[PDB]
Write a protein that binds this ligand. Sequence first.
Ligand code: NDP
Length: 271
Amino acid sequence: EAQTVISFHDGHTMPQIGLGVWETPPDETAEVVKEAVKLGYRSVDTARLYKNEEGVGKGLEDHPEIFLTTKLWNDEQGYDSTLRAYEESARLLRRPVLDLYLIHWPMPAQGQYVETWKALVELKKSGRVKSIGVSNFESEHLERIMDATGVVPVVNQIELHPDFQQRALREFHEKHNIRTESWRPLGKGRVLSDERIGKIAEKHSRTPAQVVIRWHLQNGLIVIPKSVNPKRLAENLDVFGFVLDADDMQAIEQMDRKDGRMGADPNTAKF
Ligand SMILES: NC(=O)C1=CN([C@@H]2O[C@H](COP(=O)(O)OP(=O)(O)OC[C@H]3O[C@@H](n4cnc5c(N)ncnc54)[C@H](OP(=O)(O)O)[C@@H]3O)[C@@H](O)[C@H]2O)C=CC1
């Protein structure tokens, strides 16, 4: 039962499930990354925010095949600053050419995300990075960057889980051939004890976590679940052995809530 992959509009391809690295210190980070790779993760996602790209870099040492994504933090937005930030990240990650680079937040009040996107466009044009995308962008922000550059992000990585399904934004992505990547895919773990999910889990002899990740997969979404537990890491990846049926998919669709968002709202975020 092979893992699936999602391909971008730019012709590049990304494993559909990856490891969300969080605020693990460098040293523990290397060992988590090494363990996850041993387990069969083919993709790792980190961010400058986390200050652990050195750890990820060391954990991926003999693993050039692993799809590597990182993100430019808010305080490095700007054309020249983003160029410098990308080159620093590539050094710390010990991968001269990264697979995906993302703007972490639009931060509209900063007024810098458009010039940041131009830097990413230049990084892609010059061959310094394979693919470029964004994170936490609303449709308006996507419109702005596409209008200014004519270059469409391959991915927008957004908070997405059964309580907050981002349906309207996904309709916009669809229209522009932008892939959706889900962060917080388990909604902090809250959904894992939901009865509706539990019933679907019993139905397939899988865990609630496995049901939820499979739901993201069946929606064509790239998913980066986070775990520090080797057992849960293994479990989260074991999701190519079953299929959620139409009834299941409808049942999860019904969980969407107007007040489901758990993280910052892009339009109002201040750090
Ligand atoms: N682009 C952005 O702005 C942001 C991106 N992110 C990304 O998304 C993630 C968000 O964090 P979080 O809400 O914790 O993410 P998730 O929705 O992936 O939930 C992870 C939590 O659930 C637990 N868990 C994972 N697998 C299982 C399982 N099989 N069974 C039971 N429990 C499980 C974990 O505990 P344990 O680790 O002990 O297994 C952890 O506490 C981070 O990895 C980060 O990379 C986060 C914030 C912002």
